């Protein structure tokens, strides 16, 4: 039983900029006779498998960029990113080995960004899918910053249950972010209406971006 | 170059017993313990798991979450590492890799986790295993996309004409809903390749072994 805990949770910090995070151990990770503290950080970006960046607290792992730097002993210790870059955005986590292993729980590193509208493309049902009776219209709102954005359905002017949307994680390049909507009809409920529209809020303009189709 | 590929993960029913693999090379496999470390889709990292090396007569050891439940061993003759899990329950519902630990016995060891594999899914659940139906999405430049919709587990793969397009390309994490998951994939590319150029989706999840490619016509 060794606790692992890290600080902040998450955090956003812009391109350039100098990124400090903690993590605590319950217990000394300090052996004695080495003096090396079995304390490791390790980067995992989006959809990737975790990567060792820092061994023995303060070592940094072959191939790891110098804006990298473990410090700290005991039971508290830092992870330090200077001129923090785009493709940084990941979450790191921080691991005891001192007795078997323990990660902490991670921080969340998302990168800020100038703000960034939106461009939103409304697809509607394919034939192949209609013929199966199904009828999904798909909205796709992508490359924006920030993360908060509105999108409305509506049906031949009326707003419209059966909405699922989903974001992705920010962009590795160009820190913005993306999100689809989905809005799932019946073929026979899709056939009773003609006009279909998207409608995304942000607050990069005061006035609703609308893309829309007629059946 | 070290490298480490899981393999075993699929379906199971609560209570259900899995196996995995991890198929290793490119060091002395023996002279290494190895590690299990698991992560629930949108959580923490979780060490399983560990079995020593030969030095030490392949000793093992396991997080009190796993203890009594999961057996880690390995075969030496070809350096594969595995996982037996048992009685199995929804919160083991990750995805697990494998990674190799340390060499207490060379002059240059270090402790950590230093190489790591790509990790194999598994569900836990009563659920049923669903194929995909693939949909093709069609309307400076122009995006298009695939809606992968109703299908059960986790995960499936999508690319762009086999991989060529990369560039350009959002796919959004799925959604479950009603024992049943959705995700699209979105493509934006110049205006005069399309339609005048072929544009395809391959789709893949291997729990069904489903293997589809849709191409992208206008309408
Ligand atoms: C009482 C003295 C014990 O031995 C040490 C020491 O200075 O405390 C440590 C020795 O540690 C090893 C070794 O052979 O080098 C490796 C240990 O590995 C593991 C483990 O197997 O559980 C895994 C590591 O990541 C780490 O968690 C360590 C622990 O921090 C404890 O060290 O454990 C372990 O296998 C021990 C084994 O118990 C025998 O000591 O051995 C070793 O460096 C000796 C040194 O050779 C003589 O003083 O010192
Ligand atoms: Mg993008
Ligand atoms: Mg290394
Ligand atoms: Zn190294
Ligand atoms: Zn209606
Ligand atoms: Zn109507
Ligand atoms: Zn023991």
């Known amino acids: 039983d060794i606790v692992m805990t890290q600080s902040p949770s998450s955090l956003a910090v812009s391109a350039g900029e100098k990124v400090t995070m903690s993590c605590k151990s319950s217990?000394?990770?300090?052996?004695?006779?080495?003096?090396?503290?079995?304390l490791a950080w390790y980067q995992q970006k989006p959809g990737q498998s975790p990567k060792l960046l820092i061994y023995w607290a303060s070592t940094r792992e072959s191939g790891v960029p110098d804006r990298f730097t473990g410090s700290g002993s005991g039971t508290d210790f830092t992870l330090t990113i200077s001129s923090v870059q785009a493709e940084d955005l990941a979450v790191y986590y921080c691991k005891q080995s001192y007795n078997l292993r323990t990660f902490g729980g991670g921080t969340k590193l998302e990168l800020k960004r100038a703000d960034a509208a939106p461009t939103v493309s409304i697809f509607p049902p394919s034939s192949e899918q209609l013929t199966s009776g199904g009828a999904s219209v798909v909205c796709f709102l992508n490359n924006f910053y920030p993360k908060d954005i509105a999108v409305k359905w509506k049906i031949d002017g009326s707003e419209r249950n059966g909405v699922l949307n989903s974001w992705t994680d920010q962009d590795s390049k160009d820190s913005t972010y993306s999100m689809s909507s989905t809005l799932t009809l019946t073929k026979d409920e899709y056939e009773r209406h003609n006009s279909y529209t998207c409608e995304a809020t942000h607050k990069t303009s005061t006035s609703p971006i609308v893309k829309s189709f007629n059946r | 170059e070290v490298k480490l590929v899981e393999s075993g993960g699929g379906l199971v029913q609560p209570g259900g017993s899995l196996r995995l693999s991890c198929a290793t090379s490119?060091?002395?496999?023996?002279?290494?313990?190895m590690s299990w470390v698991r992560q629930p889709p949108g959580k923490a990292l979780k060490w399983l798991a560990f079995?020593?090396?030969?030095?030490?007569?392949?000793?093992?050891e396991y997080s009190a979450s796993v203890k009594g439940r999961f057996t880690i061993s390995r075969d030496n003759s070809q350096s594969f590492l595995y996982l037996q899990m048992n009685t199995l329950r929804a919160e083991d519902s990750a995805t697990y890799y494998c990674?190799?630990?340390?060499?207490?016995?060379?002059?240059?060891?270090?402790?950590?986790?230093?190489?790591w594999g790509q990790g194999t899914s598994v569900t836990v659940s009563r659920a049923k295993t669903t194929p995909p139906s693939v949909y093709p999405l069609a309307p400076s430049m122009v995006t298009l996309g695939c809606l992968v919709k109703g299908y059960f587990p986790e995960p499936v793969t999508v690319t762009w004409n086999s991989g060529s397009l990369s560039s350009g390309v959002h796919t959004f994490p799925a959604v479950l809903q009603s024992d049943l998951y959705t995700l699209s994939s979105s493509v934006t590319v110049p205006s005069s390749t399309w339609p005048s150029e072929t544009v395809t989706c391959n789709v893949a999840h291997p729990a069904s072994s489903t293997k589809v490619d849709k191409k992208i016509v206008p309408r």
């Open positions: 079995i020593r090396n030969k030095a030490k007569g392949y000793t093992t």
């Open positions: 990674a190799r630990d340390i060499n207490p016995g060379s002059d240059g060891y270090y402790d950590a986790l230093d190489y």
């Open positions: 217990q000394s990770l300090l052996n004695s006779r080495t003096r090396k503290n079995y």
């Open positions: 490119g060091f002395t496999f023996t002279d290494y313990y």
